[PDB]
Amino acid sequence: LICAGMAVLFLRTPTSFLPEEDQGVFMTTAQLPSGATMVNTTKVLQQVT
Amino acid sequence: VPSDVISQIKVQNNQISGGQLGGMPQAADQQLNASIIVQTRLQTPEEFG
Numbered sequence: 001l002i003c004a005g006m007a008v009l010f011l012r013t014p015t016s017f018l019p020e021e022d023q024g025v026f027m028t029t030a031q032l033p034s035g036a037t038m039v040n041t042t043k044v045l046q047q048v049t
Numbered sequence: 050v051p052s053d054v055i056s057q058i059k060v061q062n063n064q065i066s067g068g069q070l071g072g073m074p075q076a077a078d079q080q081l082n083a084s085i086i087v088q089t090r091l092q093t094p095e096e097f098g
Contacts, residue, residue, distance in 0.1 A: 037071065037080045
């Protein structure tokens, strides 16, 4: 019965990889449609700023 | 003469960097940016012929 119990505990941990944390600084990316002129990218980045 | 044949093969079986329309630096009011294809390396024997 104890074997069944900690086998239930054994099956309780899925195969994840790693959790997240706090760092202090982050990054924002902007992607524009294919064939977009750099002027539009500059406008979008200025809007983000 | 074989020399001219070699020279012509070198010329016609050549890849040429065609640049692109509206590359950097560009005007302030254009929206089009596309690569330019000029010449590609030959593939088939009848292409060489």
